[PDB]
Every structure is written in structure tokens, then in C-alpha cells.
Symmetry: D3
Subunit: 249 residues, 6 copies
């Protein structure tokens, strides 16, 4: 009736079966403001929840927090309340030189460098989006006029060593991750983020539709920031909202 972490009920969702799930609680409201009749529902820990409407239909907006453990909680509890479709929006670091700060990336498969995904399916199972959601997300991202890239995302449990950052307190990166970036680069992996491997594996093995779209906020091959930036977020959230439109009507 009423879930452990989210602090909402089935009634609060008003028949919603699609969710937009940004990482940052501070983005939930932003996204809801782009839809119709946004209403605040609840906020507990990293879970801020809104209801809104698109084309006359209920949509839920719920933040995940950073990483797959907290993402998994959110997805499962919305699912218990009737949600069947999940559209993730986020920020990403690009690892290809042809990929630009400001570009959108739609994830066609994730490399599983996370742990939560294994709580749903064995390593050999693909971290793959629902086909309709990936489709809708590509359309939406191209409709924004930005450059869009479809493809493989490296989904890490850490922001630092698992993305091979060396500018850290120790300067160390464990063997498994030493040289990992060049390896992903040669395989044609586009980008780094931290939630998609869990999300996609969990959804694809559990009877749920999911996808991931992210705006590129940094490129790891050049490193340099241009600042501005907020527009990338602005574009990201317009695109995810658009994608939800296409899933609905």
C-alpha cells in the first residue's frame, strides 16, 4: 500500500505507469515543471517524488541518488505501485574524441562495472534498454537539434578509480581498472556514468521497460571545460520529457 523508502502510495501516483528518474533530487522539480499539473508528493533521504501529467496521463518523477544500490530501491518500489516504464536522464563523461561537450548520448548497452546488476541477473545477461524506450529517446534527442550518439556506456560503481581518475588522495587505481579507459575507447565505448548497468539489467530481467539518455558535461580526452554548462542540463531534461511524450501519446 505504502512503500518503505519513497513514502508514497499507489493512490498518490494516480494511475501513472511511466517514471522519469534523474539522479539529483534537485532535478525532480525542474523536470516536473516541464509537464502539466506538477504536484509535490514526498521527499525522504535522496528520494524526491513528484506527480505530473503529459498528454492527459500521469507520470511520476523520482530521483535515484548516486549509484545502482539507491537506484534499485527506487525502481523496485515504484514498480510495486504500478509503474512499468522508466526513463533515466543524467550527466556523463565522454571518452571518445569525436564526442562533444553538449552532445546527448542514448545508451544501447552498458558495460557492467557495477555490483547491483548481479543482484538481478548473472554477469552474462545483457544490460540492454527496452527497444521502444531507446527508440523514443533517440527521436527526442535528435528533435532537440543537438548531436546525438547511440551506443555503449561504461557504467561504474565509483566516480573515481573505476573511471580511471588518478587525481585522488592515493593516486592509485587497482589493476582491473589500470588502462581500462583506453580499452573501452578501443572497443568504441562512448561514455562513463554510474546508474545504467543496474537500471537496465534489473529492468530487462524483471519485466520492465527502461532507457538512459545523458548530456555530455565533460570529455575525458581533452579534459578542458568551456563554463556555461547549465544549458546541457536544460537540454537533457527537455529531451527526457519529450521521450516520455512519445512513450505515452
Amino acid at each position: 500500500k505504502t512503500v518503505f523508502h519513497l513514502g508514497v502510495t499507489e493512490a498518490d501516483l494516480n494511475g501513472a505507469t511511466l517514471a522519469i528518474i534523474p539522479g539529483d533530487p534537485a532535478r525532480v522539480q525542474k523536470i516536473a515543471e516541464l509537464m502539466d499539473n506538477p504536484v509535490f508528493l514526498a521527499s525522504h533521504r535522496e528520494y524526491t517524488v513528484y506527480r505530473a501529467e503529459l498528454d492527459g496521463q500521469s507520470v511520476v518523477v523520482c530521483s535515484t541518488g548516486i549509484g545502482g544500490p539507491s537506484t534499485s530501491i527506487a525502481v523496485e518500489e515504484l514498480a510495486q505501485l504500478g509503474v512499468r516504464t522508466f526513463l533515466r536522464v543524467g550527466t556523463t563523461g565522454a571518452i571518445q574524441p569525436h564526442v562533444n561537450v553538449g552532445d546527448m548520448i542514448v545508451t544501447t548497452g552498458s558495460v557492467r562495472l557495477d555490483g547491483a546488476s548481479l543482484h538481478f541477473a548473472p554477469m552474462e545477461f545483457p544490460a540492454v534498454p527496452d527497444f521502444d524506450v531507446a527508440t523514443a529517446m533517440k527521436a527526442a534527442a535528435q528533435e532537440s537539434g543537438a548531436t546525438v550518439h547511440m551506443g555503449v556506456t561504461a557504467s561504474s560503481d565509483t566516480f573515481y578509480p573505476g573511471q580511471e581518475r588518478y587525481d585522488t588522495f592515493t593516486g592509485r587505481v587497482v589493476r582491473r581498472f589500470q588502462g581500462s579507459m583506453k580499452e573501452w575507447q578501443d572497443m568504441g565505448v562512448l561514455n562513463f556514468e554510474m546508474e545504467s548497468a543496474t537500471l537496465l539489467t534489473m529492468c530487462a530481467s524483471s519485466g520492465l521497460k527502461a532507457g538512459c539518455v545523458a548530456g555530455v558535461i565533460i570529455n575525458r580526452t581533452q579534459k578542458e571545460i568551456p563554463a556555461t554548462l547549465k544549458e546541457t542540463e536544460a537540454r537533457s531534461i527537455k529531451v527526457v520529457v519529450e521521450a516520455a511524450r512519445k512513450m505515452l501519446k
Copy 2:
């Protein structure tokens, strides 16, 4: 010059950048036969290579044989002569009761129950089709008015124990694969085949575009295997779909 197993040259392909790759060599000619200017190129081991023309472009048809290892040879060597897109057509066993004998399945991702995918990318890497190919194949399948499913495929190095078959010489399945089919069923996996995990992982980690479309020849929830007039028909429909998909890619 000449690639080692395929026995063809760059000139032989006549500028083709796309391939249809069935498993069965018998299918190579039947597929070429549906396009323009079918030309036989080579038959070596399990590799029978034709050239043909679609919309004024050369298309290669090349069989892979059964399993990832032999497929991996076909792809790599075709790639060396300049092929960049690979459309696999194969047969499959459904493991969902709603999926009927005759339906088509376009793989959106493969469970890697194979060995050869590991020779290209580590287990964590997704065995996923290139999105355009998968899109092309969906459209082609729908437009031919066939029941088409999009989903995850379990892609196994064996036909028997790795697909949890007990009607065998020993009757025994190793621990890893005992109860495995039911697990795949609970997760929503649609089908069993033997080549896609290798194909998809290889291509996606190598700068090549690939997809896998397969005709359902058996449903593993029913006991009784379907007849000859259905097998031959499934193959016929399947061949049509992949060629139509090839057309959509070329433009």
C-alpha cells in the same frame, strides 16, 4: 589478397560493405537467389560465399556454420575485405509460451553463454546489436506481416546441456545449467540460439554493425516438434525478412 578460410579476395566482393550471414551453407544460395545477379564465389569447409546485388549495390552472403568460433572467422575475414555490416539470419527455440512457431525474433541483447565473445570483450560488456540494424530488422519483419518479437536471446555454446535438454546420451546437465531455462523464462528471455552472443559482442567492440533475426522453429514449452511444411516455410519467411532488412540498411 585471399583470406585464409573464406578463399575470396577484395575484388570478389566487388565493393560490398554489407553481409547476410546464415549458419547453414544450404541457405547461402537461396538468399542470393532473391537478389539480383547471384554469383557464386567459394565453398570451403562450412563457408559458402555468394555475391549478389541489391538496389545496384553488391551484397555478400556467407554461411557461418554452427557456433561462435566459426562465425568469428567469417566476420573477421569479411571485415578484412571491407565489410562493415552483418545481418545474421538463423533459427531458434522459443522459451516463452506466447511466442509461436513461425514468429520472428529480433535480438536486442544476448546472454553470453558462449566462449568466443570473451575473446573480444570481457563478460561485463553487453552483447548488443547495432541500433540501425536492429531497427531495420524490426521494420522488415513487420512489413512482411509476421508476428515479430523484440527481446533478449540466450546464446549458448551447446545445443544440448547449455539449452537444458535432458533427452541425451547421458541425460545429465551440469550444475551451472540445471534449472537454467526456467531462470531465463522468469527473466523474460525469448529464445535460445548459438551464434548471437559472439557476433554481437565481437561487432560492438570492433567498429562493425550487426544484428540477428531468427525464425522460431520450435517452442520448448510444447513437447511436440513442428512439421516439415512449417520448417521450410519458416526458413522461407526468415530469408525474405533478412533481405528486406538488408535493403533498408543500404539506403
Copy 3:
């Protein structure tokens, strides 16, 4: 300001080399209020930061959010700002019959059912606390008058399947975790939690000092589900115990 997520500088910390790291941002304030001169520093995403004084020395307080990935960012950036000692306080589910709601557990080693710990050390490395931190935590816990258990904690990347919960949307639990609780019971594992394996492995392999203490808010084996009052007293006792442990660590 000098770190990506936490948005503080080392100066903001006022000398602090010890941090108390609860999971819930809401509890950051309550912990700091048990000490001297609590000061709000920042709040970004799951990360709320306070400093305060214990016996005239600076202590930072910083939420982790739920799970190893968010925990790991907080620890690294706090380490970047000179923090060297990490006192984790949390809630836990018990799996031993002899451990009752309201007891304290001090982790002497974590079962690594997480993924982020593998980003600092391969699986064979022990998820173990700094001995000094564990000692201090035990002495703090006993001096509270509470019942205190020392032992192994199962630290899971999920709240549901990885803690073998079946009260879920699918009701399904992957093979790896089917029967996992029974196995942990038989092995004498004391409790389930979500951040200890990442924290302890990270610190033990990075020249940093860490321990974990948690209040038992449920016993999964017995189905002890407690009052809001009990839940409150337990939370209160935990926070108090961790502040005391902090006081013992301080020179």
C-alpha cells in the same frame, strides 16, 4: 569548492581529521547537535555536511547516501580534505536469533556483496575495520549500557534480492542469492547492511581508518518488527554511541 560533490574546502572543516558518516542526510544534524558548536557547511544531492567540536577538536559529519557508490565519493573527497578517520553509524537487520532489536553491532569484517569495493581491491582482500576504530566503537557501545555484538556483517548492493527479500514486484531472487541468508546464518554472520563492505575495503586499502557500528532495527530471522518508540530509542542510542566512539579516538 575544492572537491566535486561535497562543495566544501579543507578550511571549512577547521582541522577535522575524523568524520562521522551516517547514511541519512536527516541524521547529520542530530549527530552534530550532540556535540559542541554545530555548524551547517553544505548540502548537495545526498551529501549534507556539518562540523562541530568534541572536547575542543573539530569533527566533520557527512551523509553517505544509500550504497557503496555514493559512500565512496564522500570518503574520497573528505580524504582529499585531510580526513583520515571514518566512523560509520547505521541501522541494520539482524539474522541471528540471539541478536535482538535494540542491540548494537560492531562490524569486524564484511561479506563483500557489493561492487564498489572491487574498485579499490580484488575480491580476496578483506573488508575489515581499523582495529583502533573497532575497539573504540566496542568500548563506546558497552559504556552505553547496550548489548553489543562483535562480528561479520553481510554488506549488500541491494536492499531487496541481495538481502533475500521476496516481498517484491517479481517475487524473484537470482540463483546467487537464493538460500544466501540461510548460508549466512549457518556461517554465524550477524546482520545485513549496505555500505560497510565498500567503506572498509576502500579505507583498509587506502591508508585510512574506518569502523562501522549499527543499531538493530529488525531481526529478519525472528520477524521482530518494532514500535516507532523502539525504532526511535535505537536510533538515539546509535548516534550517541558513535559520538562517544569519536571521543575515544581523539588525541
Copy 4:
């Protein structure tokens, strides 16, 4: 009493309990031709099947195609029809400088770099020939008067990256196989082929006798791709040797 892929009944094999299993369908006839009363039985996909006699007893010749997946189908379906002894003959690449082209190698254990073996036994189980078969093979190989080597074989699911070939479309070798040849070479491993890991594991764990003998068609300390001048002579020796090994098994 029939089988899915092979297209032959039990009667067709006329009581045969032993099969010679080359990889290449074109070697089936040639091996059959060295025996008595050879009869073509069937051909489907990579499976070409003959029957012949040695010393008044029936023997099956069946190609397996390239790799363990296609091999496992063949071995399983022969086994269903009463075959118990499997003698594989193939071509191999030698990785030790002291092994010459034209030499014979009898495998005494395989490095399992395949995937299909896992479908029969977990990785810890050795990929080991039946002692008798391997004895017969050694004897037959010596009698041919080529140099014969007994030892460990690396059996790979790929021709290219898993045998550390770099003259490829990408030139890329995944971390796991990057430096693998220098490792095998330093462990005294003798050669590379693609089927023995699957064959040996499968039989050794399933109540079946098996071995693998191979003609050296290339020395990998020299070149990557085999040249045609060589294939012809080494083949000739290989196929006589394996027929001699079979005669010896039958008594």
C-alpha cells in the same frame, strides 16, 4: 532411432562404436578412402558422414566443423547412436620454436580457452584424453616416422584474438589474451587449435573415450597465416596416422 543434425540412423552405422572426427568435411572422404568398404551416408551443414571398416569392424567418419559448439553436436549425436570412442584429427599451429611444420602432436591435456567445455564440466575439471586412445595415437604417430610430440595444447574458441593473432581488421587483442602466447610458451604448451578442449572435457566427463592428434601446418614463431604448399603433405600424414590409431584401438 534417429538424430537432429547428422541425418543418420543407428542402422546406418552398422554397429560402429568408434568414430574418426576430422574438422573439415572435405577430409571425411579422404580418411574413409584409407579404410575398407567406405560408404557415403549423409551430408548436412558442416556434417558429412561416411561408414567404413578396419579389421572387419565398422567405423564412422564424421566431420565436426570448426569449433566446440559444432563438435559437441556431432559427438552427442554419435553417442546417442552407440559410438563410444572419438578420435579427432586436425591441423594445428605450433608455438614452441623446436616444433617443425609436418610434425605430429598428440594432446595429453588442453588449456580450456573455449566455452562449450563449461557446458559439461566446471573449469577445474581437466581436459584430458582417454589414456588408451592417447597411447594408440602416440604409437600410430611414431610409426609414420614424422617427429611426434606429446604435450599440452591451448584450445581456443577463436582463430584470431584467442590465438593472439594481430594481423587483423582491428589489430586489437583483449586484455586476457594480450600476452597469452608468451605465457603458454613459457609454460611449455606445444600448440594451438580450436576443438580439443571441448572434445576432451565432454568425453572425459561423460563416459566416452577420446583423443586428439594434429599435423603441424604452421609454426607461430614464424608467421600468422598458413601457406598452401604445406597443407597437402601434412594432411596426408595426419589422416594415415589417425586411421592407424583407430586400427590399434579396435583389436
Copy 5:
């Protein structure tokens, strides 16, 4: 009237002992029991030399384990069938941190599992951790000796040579897995190499038994590969006194 397979002692022989001291080397069994009260030779079979003694009025077993977790697991299991619940290992170890000297004592607070037999008790993710009481008793016994005492992580290896990344061997070869592992353990703060603690701690920690491991540093791997003779018996002496003191504290 139970009499175990390898040890060849009975429950009666232990006279109620619930604590054991378990050195690697049979030569040390008598030396340790000789530091105790009323030592009695019980049995010797294979690498298993067993004595009984008493300490602050309670029976104690001394039993060698031999080298490695396989032989250790047999001894621990068989002693447990006979009522033993607490196990204190003493041994030798090689230091891998520059600040740790020959002569120092190292008390293991957790082991890197580079063994095989630990997996026969618990899967890799389970921690090879001592019982907190024993480690405490061991810390305090060790400090009591006026040796420098170090608490930390120990790499517990199934080999003396490649697993501890020794190159001065027959082949000079080290398999990929252990190529450059020493530097990695150094970088992570790991203190020392030895061969029994992962099996011992994982086994007991998952089996309702109390265990710990204290070891004297016989070599520093920043200096040489092979351990020197002069250091041996002085470091042996202090080590066996430390373990005897730790058992006292355990017993009360």
C-alpha cells in the same frame, strides 16, 4: 570415546581443553608446551605433533599444523570434534612494508585470500577475519614483549615462491596473476606475507570458532628474497612467548 583420523588423540587426552595453540612447525610444539604448566606429550603423526599443558589452571592443546591451509584445516577440524573452540596460531612471516623490521610481531586483523582451502568454508566475498577477542589478547601479549607490534592486513598465500612473487627460483617465472602483486599489496598497506591465516580465519570465522594469528618478522622483502639464519631463533623465542601470553589472557 572418539579418536580422530589424523591427530590420533582422544577427547579424554585433551582433559577438557577448549583452547589450542597451533604453530606451523612440529619442532615448536614441545618448545611452546614447555613454557606452560605440566606439559605432556600426547601423539605425533605426519606433520601433527600434539601435546597437552595447563595454563592458569586450565587444559590447553599444542598442535602443529604443518605448512599451508590444507594441513591446517585438518588439524583445526579434528581438534574441534574433540571440543576445542579457540585457536591461536603462531608463525613466521615476511615483511613487505619498509618500516617493519626483522624481530617485530604482526597481529593479523584480516587476510588477503590467496589460498584455496578458505573457499571450502566460505565463498571469496566472506572476510578472513580474526575473532576480535583473540586479536585483542594477541595485541596485548605482543606489546607485553617489548617488540614493536603491528596490526594490519596479511597476504596469505598458497605458495612460498610465485604467490609471494619470489623470482629467484628454478624457472624465474611468475604467472600473470602474481606479476607485480607485491607492489600492489605494498600500495594497499598490506604488511606481510604468510601461508596459513586465510584458511584458518575464514574457516573459524564461518564455523563458530575463535581464531587469530600472530607472527614474528623473519625477513623484509624490500631487502632480500630468502630469510637469514641469525635472526631465526631470537625471533622464534619471542614469538612463542607472545602466543603463550595471549592464551593466558584468553583463558582468565
Copy 6:
């Protein structure tokens, strides 16, 4: 110039290139006394070392103790002093109903249920004997009139749970090994033993010749402790066979 554990020199071995390596120190003298000129050399920890002569050649006899870690030190240190061939004789527990107490088993391959084998080669490498040594051992066993079985041996790092014994202090066997005996049984594994996986892998990957023969002292379909008289009988057979095997190697 000496070795660290064995306390012997190259001089002490007097040119010997073959070793007989039993598990039990007690056995070393009894083996040596079956040859010419036995000479006690050293005894330190579990390593008793003798020298003797067989057909005018020096032979070393060196005990290993129980388990692969102590075995590995013994083989390494003997090899540093120029030993190249190692023949293990040990005791074993059969798991097949038709193997009797008293019988000999020569190992053709070991299931690697140990840890130390991984310190010389990764899991996929086969744990297999030198074919010459295994041939010598089979011959030595047949000619002495004992029953010999050739086959696969499960080589375990523990006596108890790794060999799926439940009559233990806990009655607990970890998931990995629950059901494993039946699995080994069903695959045709002959026996259980603790040293062969380490020895065979280490030697096969390091240019040394090795083998393992074992006297069956127990059958797990029986679970009985044998008579003093049948135990001593078996040991006498075991050692006679290994010495005869060593002789065939020197001829």
C-alpha cells in the same frame, strides 16, 4: 647454495635427477630402504630427505606433507638442485563403487579443487601428468599384480568439506561442495586426494616431469576405516610400485 626448507645441497643429491615424493615423512625411509645405499640427508618440518640408488643412479626420496602448499615448496627446492622428474605415491579415497581398497590409481588428470595450482597456471590449464611417467606407473602397477585404474582424480585443498564429508564438527558443507561427490561420480572421477592438482599443474607448466600413483585406503560408497593389516598391505604395494616405476624411468 643450500635450499631454505629442505636443508640439503646439490652435493647431497649426488647427481640425482629423479625424486620419489610421498606425503607422509614416515614413508621416506621405507621407500629408500627398498633401493641401494640409502642415506639419510635431512629432516626439517614435514620434509624428510633421503638419497638412495637404483640401477647405479642416485634417486632422491622426499616427503611433501599434506596439501599443495607444502608440496610446492618441496618440488621447487628439489628442482633448484637439478631434480626434473617427480613421482608421487600417496593414499586415496575412491568414489566409484567398483574400486576396492587395496587397488592402485594412476592419475591421468586432476580436478583442480586446490589453490596452489593457480599460482603456476590459471584455472583453464590442464592438471595432467607427464605421459612417460604415467606410462611407467601403469606398467609398474600391472606387472606387480595389483589392480590399476587409469583416470581423473579430484584433488582437494581440504580433507573434509572439499571431499563432501558431513560427519564433522558442524555438519556444514559450503554451497560450492554441496552435491559435488555425486557430480564427480556421475562424470567418472575415480578418487579424492589432496596433492595431485598442485603437483601436476606446477610441473606441467614448469618443464618438469611428474605423475601420481595412490593406494586406495578408503571408498566413499562404503565409509569404513580399514584394518591395520589392509592399510599396511596397501602401503607396501604402493611403495613397491613407485620404486618399480622410478626404475622404468631410468632404464
